[PDB]
Coordinates of C-alpha atoms and ligand atoms in Angstrom, one line a residue:
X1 CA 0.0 0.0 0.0
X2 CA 1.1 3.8 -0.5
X3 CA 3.1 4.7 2.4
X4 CA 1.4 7.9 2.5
X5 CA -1.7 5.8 3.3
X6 CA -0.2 3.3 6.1
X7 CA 1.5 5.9 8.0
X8 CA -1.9 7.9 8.5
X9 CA -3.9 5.2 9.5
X10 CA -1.5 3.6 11.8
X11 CA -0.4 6.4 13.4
X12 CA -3.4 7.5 14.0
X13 CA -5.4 4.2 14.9
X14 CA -3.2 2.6 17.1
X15 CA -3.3 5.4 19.8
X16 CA -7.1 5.5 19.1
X17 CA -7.1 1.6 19.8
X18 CA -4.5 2.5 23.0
X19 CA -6.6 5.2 24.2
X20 CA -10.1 3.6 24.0
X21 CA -8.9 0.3 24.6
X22 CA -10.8 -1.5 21.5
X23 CA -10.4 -5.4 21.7
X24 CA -10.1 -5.1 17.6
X25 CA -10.5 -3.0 14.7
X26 CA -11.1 -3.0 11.0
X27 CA -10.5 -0.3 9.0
X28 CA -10.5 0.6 4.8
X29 CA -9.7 4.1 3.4
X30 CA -10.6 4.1 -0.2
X31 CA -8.0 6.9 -2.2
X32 CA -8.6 7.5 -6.0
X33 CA -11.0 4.6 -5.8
X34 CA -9.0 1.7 -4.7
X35 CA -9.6 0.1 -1.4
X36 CA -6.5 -0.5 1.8
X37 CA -7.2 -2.0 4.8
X38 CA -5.8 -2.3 8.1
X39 CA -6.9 -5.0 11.0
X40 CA -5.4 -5.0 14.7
X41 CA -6.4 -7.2 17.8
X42 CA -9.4 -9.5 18.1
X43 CA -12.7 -10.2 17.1
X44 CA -12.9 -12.9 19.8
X45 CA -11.3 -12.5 22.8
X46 CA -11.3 -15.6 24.8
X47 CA -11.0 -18.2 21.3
X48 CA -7.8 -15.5 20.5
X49 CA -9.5 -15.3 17.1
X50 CA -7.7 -12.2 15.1
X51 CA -9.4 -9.5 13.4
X52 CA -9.0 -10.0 9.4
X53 CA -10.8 -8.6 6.4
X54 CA -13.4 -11.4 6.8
X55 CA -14.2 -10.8 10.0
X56 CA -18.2 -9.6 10.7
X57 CA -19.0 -6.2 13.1
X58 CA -22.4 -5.3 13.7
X59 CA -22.6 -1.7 12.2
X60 CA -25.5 -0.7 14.1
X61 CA -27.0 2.5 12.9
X62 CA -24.7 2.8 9.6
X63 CA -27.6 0.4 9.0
X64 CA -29.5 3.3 8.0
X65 CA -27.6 3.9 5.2
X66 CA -28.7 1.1 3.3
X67 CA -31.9 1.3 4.5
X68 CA -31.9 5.2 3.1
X69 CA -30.7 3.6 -0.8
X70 CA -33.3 1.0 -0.5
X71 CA -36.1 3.3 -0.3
X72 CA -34.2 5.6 -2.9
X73 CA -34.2 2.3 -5.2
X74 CA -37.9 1.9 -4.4
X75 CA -38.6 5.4 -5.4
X76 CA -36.6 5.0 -8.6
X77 CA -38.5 2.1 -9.5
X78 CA -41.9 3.9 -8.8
X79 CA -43.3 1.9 -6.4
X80 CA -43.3 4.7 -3.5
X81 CA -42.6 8.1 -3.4
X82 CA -41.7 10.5 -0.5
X83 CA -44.4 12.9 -0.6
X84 CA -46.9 9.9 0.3
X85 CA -48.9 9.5 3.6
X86 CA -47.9 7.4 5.9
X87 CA -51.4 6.0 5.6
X88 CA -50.9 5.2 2.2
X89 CA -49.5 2.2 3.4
X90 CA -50.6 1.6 6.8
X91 CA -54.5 2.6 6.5
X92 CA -54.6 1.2 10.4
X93 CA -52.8 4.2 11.5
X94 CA -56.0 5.8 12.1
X95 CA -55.1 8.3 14.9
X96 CA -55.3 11.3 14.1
X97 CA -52.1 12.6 14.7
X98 CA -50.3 10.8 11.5
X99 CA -52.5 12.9 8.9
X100 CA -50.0 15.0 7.8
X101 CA -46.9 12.9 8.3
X102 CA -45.6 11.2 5.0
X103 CA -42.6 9.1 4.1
X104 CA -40.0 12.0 4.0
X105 CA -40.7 12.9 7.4
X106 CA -40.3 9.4 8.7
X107 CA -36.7 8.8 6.5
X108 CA -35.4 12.3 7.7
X109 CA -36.4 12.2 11.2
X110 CA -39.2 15.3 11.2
X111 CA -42.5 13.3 11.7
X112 CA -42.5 15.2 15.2
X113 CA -40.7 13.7 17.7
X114 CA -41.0 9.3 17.2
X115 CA -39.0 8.1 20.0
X116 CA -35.5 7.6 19.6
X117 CA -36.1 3.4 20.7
X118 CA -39.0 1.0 20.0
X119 CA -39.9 -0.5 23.2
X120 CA -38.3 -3.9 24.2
X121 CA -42.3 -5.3 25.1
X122 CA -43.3 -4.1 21.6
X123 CA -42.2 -7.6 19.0
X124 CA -45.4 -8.4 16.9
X125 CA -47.1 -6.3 13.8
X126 CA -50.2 -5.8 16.2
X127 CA -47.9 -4.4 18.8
X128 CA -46.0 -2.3 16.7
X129 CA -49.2 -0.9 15.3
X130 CA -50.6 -0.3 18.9
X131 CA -47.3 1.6 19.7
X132 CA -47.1 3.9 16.4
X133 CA -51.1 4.6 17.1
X134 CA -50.3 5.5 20.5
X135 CA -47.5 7.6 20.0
X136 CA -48.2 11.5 20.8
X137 CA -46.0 13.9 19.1
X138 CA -44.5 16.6 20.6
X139 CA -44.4 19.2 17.7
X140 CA -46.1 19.4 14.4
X141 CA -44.2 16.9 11.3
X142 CA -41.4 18.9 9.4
X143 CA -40.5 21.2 12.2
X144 CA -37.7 19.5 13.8
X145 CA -35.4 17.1 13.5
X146 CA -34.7 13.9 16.6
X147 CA -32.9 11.1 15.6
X148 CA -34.8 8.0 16.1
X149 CA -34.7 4.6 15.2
X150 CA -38.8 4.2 15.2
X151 CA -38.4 7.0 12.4
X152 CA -36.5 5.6 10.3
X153 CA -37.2 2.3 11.2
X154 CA -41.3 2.1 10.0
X155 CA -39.5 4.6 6.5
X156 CA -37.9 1.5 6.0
X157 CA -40.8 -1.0 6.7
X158 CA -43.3 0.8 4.3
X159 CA -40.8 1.6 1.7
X160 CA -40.9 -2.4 0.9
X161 CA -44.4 -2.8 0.9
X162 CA -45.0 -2.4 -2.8
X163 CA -42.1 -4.9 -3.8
X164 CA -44.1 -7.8 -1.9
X165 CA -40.7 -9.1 -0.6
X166 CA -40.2 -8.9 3.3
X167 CA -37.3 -6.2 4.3
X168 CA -34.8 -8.7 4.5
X169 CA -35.6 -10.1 0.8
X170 CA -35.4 -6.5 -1.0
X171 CA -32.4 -5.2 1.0
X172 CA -30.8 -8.6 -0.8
X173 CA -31.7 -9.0 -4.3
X174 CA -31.9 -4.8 -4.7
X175 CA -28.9 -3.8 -2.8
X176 CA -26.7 -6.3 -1.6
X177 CA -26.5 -8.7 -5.1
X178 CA -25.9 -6.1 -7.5
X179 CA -23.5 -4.4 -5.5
X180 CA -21.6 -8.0 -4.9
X181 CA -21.6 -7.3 -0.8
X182 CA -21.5 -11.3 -1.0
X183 CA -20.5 -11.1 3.6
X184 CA -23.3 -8.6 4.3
X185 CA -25.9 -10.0 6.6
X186 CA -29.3 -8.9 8.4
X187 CA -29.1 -12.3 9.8
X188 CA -25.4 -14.0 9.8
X189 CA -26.3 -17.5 8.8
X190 CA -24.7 -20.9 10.8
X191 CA -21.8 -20.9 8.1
X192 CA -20.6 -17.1 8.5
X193 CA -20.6 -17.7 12.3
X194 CA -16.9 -18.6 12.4
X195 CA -16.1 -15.1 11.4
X196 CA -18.5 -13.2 13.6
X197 CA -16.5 -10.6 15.9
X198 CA -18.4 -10.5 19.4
X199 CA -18.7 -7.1 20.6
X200 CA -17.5 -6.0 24.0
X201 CA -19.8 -4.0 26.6
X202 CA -18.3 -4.2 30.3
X203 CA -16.2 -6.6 29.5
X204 CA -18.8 -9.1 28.4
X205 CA -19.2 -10.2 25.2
X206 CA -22.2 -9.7 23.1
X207 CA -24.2 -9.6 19.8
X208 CA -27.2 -7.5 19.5
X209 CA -30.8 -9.0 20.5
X210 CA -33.6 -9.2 18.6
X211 CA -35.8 -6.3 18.4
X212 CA -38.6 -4.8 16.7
X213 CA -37.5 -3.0 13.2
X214 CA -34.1 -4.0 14.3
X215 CA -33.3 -4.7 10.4
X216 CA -34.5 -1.7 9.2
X217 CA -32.7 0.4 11.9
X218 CA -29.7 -1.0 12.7
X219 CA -29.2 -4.8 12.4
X220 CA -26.7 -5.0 9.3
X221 CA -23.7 -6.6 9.7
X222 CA -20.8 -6.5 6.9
X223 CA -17.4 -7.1 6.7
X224 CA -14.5 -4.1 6.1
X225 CA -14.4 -5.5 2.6
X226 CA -17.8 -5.0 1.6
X227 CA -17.9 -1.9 3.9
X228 CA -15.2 -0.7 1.5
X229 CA -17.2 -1.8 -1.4
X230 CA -20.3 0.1 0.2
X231 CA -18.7 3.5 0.3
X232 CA -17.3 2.6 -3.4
X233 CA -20.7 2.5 -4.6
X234 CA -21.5 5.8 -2.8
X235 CA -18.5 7.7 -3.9
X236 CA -19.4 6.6 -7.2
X237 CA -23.2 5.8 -8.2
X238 CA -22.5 7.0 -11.5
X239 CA -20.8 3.3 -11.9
X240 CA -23.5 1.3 -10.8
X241 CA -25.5 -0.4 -13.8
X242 CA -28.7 -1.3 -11.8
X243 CA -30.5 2.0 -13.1
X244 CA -33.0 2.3 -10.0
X245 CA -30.3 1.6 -7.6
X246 CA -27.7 4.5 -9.2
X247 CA -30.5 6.4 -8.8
X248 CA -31.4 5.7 -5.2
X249 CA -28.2 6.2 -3.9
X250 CA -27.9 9.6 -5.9
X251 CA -31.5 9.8 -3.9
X252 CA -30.4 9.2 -0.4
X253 CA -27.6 12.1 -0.5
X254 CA -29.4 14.8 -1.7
X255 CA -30.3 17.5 1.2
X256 CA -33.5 17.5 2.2
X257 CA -33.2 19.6 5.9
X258 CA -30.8 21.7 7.1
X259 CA -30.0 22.6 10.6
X260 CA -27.1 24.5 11.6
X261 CA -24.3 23.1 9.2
X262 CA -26.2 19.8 8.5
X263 CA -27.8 18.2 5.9
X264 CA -30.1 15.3 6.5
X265 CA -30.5 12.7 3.4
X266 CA -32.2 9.5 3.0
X267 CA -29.3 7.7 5.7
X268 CA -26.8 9.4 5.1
X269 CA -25.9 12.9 6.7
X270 CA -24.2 15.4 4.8
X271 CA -22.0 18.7 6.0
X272 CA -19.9 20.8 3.2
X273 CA -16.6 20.4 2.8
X274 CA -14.4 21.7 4.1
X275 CA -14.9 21.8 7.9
X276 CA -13.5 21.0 10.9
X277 CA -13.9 17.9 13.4
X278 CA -15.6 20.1 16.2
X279 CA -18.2 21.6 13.6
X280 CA -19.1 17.9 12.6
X281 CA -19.4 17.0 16.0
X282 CA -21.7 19.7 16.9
X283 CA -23.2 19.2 13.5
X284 CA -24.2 15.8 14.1
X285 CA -25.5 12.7 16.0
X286 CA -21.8 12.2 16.6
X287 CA -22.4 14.5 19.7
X288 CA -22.7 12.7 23.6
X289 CA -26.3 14.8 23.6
X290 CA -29.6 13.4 22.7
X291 CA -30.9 16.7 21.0
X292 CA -34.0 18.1 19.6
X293 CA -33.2 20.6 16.5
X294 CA -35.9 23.1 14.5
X295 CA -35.1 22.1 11.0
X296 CA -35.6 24.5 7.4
X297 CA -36.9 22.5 4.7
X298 CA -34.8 22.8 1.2
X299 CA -37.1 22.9 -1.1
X300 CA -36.9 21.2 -3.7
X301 CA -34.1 19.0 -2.3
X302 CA -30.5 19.9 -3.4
X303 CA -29.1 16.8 -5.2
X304 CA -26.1 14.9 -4.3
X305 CA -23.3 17.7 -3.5
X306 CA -19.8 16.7 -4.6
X307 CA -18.1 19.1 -2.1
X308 CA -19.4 17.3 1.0
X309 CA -18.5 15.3 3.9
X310 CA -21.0 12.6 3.6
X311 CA -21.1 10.2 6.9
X312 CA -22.9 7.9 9.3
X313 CA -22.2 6.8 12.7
X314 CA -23.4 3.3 14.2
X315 CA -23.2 1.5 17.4
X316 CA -24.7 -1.5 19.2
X317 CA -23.9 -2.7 22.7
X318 CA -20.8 -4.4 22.2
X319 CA -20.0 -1.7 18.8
X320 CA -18.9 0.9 17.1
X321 CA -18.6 2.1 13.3
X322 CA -18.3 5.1 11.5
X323 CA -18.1 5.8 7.6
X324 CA -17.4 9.1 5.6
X325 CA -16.4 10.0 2.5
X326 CA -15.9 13.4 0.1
X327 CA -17.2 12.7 -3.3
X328 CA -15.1 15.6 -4.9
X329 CA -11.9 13.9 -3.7
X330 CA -12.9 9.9 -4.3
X331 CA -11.9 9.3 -0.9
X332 CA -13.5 7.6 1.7
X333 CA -13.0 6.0 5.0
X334 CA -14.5 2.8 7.3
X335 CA -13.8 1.9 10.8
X336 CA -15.5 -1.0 12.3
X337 CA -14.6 -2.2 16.0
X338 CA -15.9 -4.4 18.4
X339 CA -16.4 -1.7 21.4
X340 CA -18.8 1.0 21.4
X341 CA -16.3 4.1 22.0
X342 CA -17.1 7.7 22.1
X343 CA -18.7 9.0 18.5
X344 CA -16.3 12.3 18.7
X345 CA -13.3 10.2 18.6
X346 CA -14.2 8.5 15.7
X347 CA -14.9 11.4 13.9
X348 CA -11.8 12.6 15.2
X349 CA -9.5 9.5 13.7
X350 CA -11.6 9.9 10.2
X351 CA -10.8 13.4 10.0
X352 CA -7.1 12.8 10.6
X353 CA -7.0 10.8 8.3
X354 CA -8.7 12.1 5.3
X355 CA -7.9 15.4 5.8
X356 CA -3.9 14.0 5.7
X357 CA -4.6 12.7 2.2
X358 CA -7.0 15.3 0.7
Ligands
SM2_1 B1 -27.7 3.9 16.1 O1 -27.7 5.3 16.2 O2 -26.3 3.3 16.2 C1 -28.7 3.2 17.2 N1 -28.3 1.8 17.5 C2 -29.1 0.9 18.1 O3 -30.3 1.1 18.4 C3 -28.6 -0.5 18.3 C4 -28.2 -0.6 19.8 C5 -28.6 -1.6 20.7 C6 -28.1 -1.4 22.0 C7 -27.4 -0.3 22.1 S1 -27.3 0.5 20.6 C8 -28.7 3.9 18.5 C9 -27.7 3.8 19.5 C10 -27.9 4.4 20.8 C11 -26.8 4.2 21.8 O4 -26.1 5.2 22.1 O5 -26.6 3.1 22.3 C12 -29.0 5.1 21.0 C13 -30.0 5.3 20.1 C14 -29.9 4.7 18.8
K2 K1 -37.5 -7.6 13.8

């Protein structure tokens, strides 16, 4: 690899790794389009099993990201569009309090406050339903923006309905296939097991339970390979041959809210470029603060920006990932570990390192 490249990465990573005390790490910068990784440490502890480039992390919320292109995809292919009611495809959700509330506000966050968690006593369809009808906002949809899994979460569970294929089913044959990310799971089957990092909370390990809209919210897991390969396809939709999926992905990062110095896409999250680590921070969910933010609408949406910092963080119990990229300079970055450490150090480390090879 370019020396440029490992000096960065290391030099950076391993205090990160030091300082936060990360049983093991993945990570992939992708420069002028090509993909380098890095591994240190363990995905399993007590079975000394290394970290390697085929080793599984739960990404957590960058599960949103591919839930974002998925909907794009389905709006490409006509079966939903963004300006729809919510009722359009849940007529149950009587209450109310959801006329008013369509698709975008439940991609980008604004429906008016959905919690940030669905309930651990709330598994089934009926329950969920119950739950959604139940639910009493605090402001009016597209004022403000709090980030919330039950949000994007149902986005993602109506955005399928059309196809007749359960979540699961879609996210594979529309997204996963075409884009070859062959070690990308919503469930890790018996036979990827043996590469499955366990995450560490306490101590303990861990994989995430199951929970309701856990797919659509935050229940991929992926390898740094196809991680790389994920933020390929981002940098660079114009490559992608599946016309509704190009499209989708050139849906998800266009800006759709602003507030302060952030843009809110389909996923993804968006600030311009250049800027500083702080300013991302603050202009983020990277921040320790659960925060409630009046949103502008842009209207109509701005498409995908070149000049941008495009990026997601994740997290389960026992993880952590973060991905960002710039467009305007093909580069991109992944880190995947298997501790959930503090969001403005990885934001931090990314910064570092792109802004050393800019
Ligand atoms: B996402 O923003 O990473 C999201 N992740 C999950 O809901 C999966 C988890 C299960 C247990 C802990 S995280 C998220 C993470 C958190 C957090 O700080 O743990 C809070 C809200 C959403
Ligand atoms: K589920």
């Amino acid at each position: 690899a370019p020396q440029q490249i490992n000096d960065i990465v290391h030099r950076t990573i391993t205090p990160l790794i030091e300082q936060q005390k990360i049983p093991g790490m993945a990570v992939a910068v992708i420069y002028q389009g090509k993909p380098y990784y890095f591994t240190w440490g363990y995905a399993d502890i007590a079975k000394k099993q290394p970290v390697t480039q085929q080793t599984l992390f739960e990404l957590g919320s960058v599960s949103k990201t591919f839930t974002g292109v998925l909907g794009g995809d389905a709006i490409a292919r006509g079966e939903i569009k963004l300006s729809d009611p919510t009722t359009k495809y849940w007529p149950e959700l009587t209450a109310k309090q959801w006329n008013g509330i369509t698709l975008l506000h439940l991609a980008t966050y604004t429906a008016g406050g959905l919690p940030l968690q669905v309930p651990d006593e709330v598994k089934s369809s009926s329950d969920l339903l119950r739950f959604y009808q139940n639910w009493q906002p605090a402001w009016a949809p597209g004022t403000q923006r709090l980030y919330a899994n039950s949000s994007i979460g149902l986005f993602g569970a109506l955005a399928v309905k059309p196809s007749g294929l359960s979540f699961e089913q879609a996210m594979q044959t529309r997204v996963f296939q075409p884009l070859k990310l062959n070690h990308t799971w919503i469930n890790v089957p018996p036979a990827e097991e043996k590469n499955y990092a366990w995450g560490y909370r306490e101590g303990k390990a861990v994989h995430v339970s199951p929970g309701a809209l856990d797919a659509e919210a935050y229940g991929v897991k992926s390898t740094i390979e196809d991680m790389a390969r994920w933020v390929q396809s981002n940098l660079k939709p114009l490559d992608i041959n599946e016309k509704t999926l190009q499209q989708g992905i050139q849906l998800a990062q266009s800006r759709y809210w602003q507030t302060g110095d952030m843009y809110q896409g389909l996923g993804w999250e968006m600030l311009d470029w250049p800027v500083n680590p702080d300013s991302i921070i603050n202009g983020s969910d990277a921040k320790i603060a659960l925060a409630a933010r009046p949103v502008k609408a842009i209207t109509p949406p701005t498409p995908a920006v070149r000049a941008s910092w495009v990026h997601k963080t994740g997290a389960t119990g026992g993880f952590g990932s973060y991905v960002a990229f710039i467009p305007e300079k093909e580069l991109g970055i992944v880190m995947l570990a298997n501790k959930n450490y503090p969001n403005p150090a990885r934001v931090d480390a990314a910064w570092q390192i792109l802004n050393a090879l800019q």
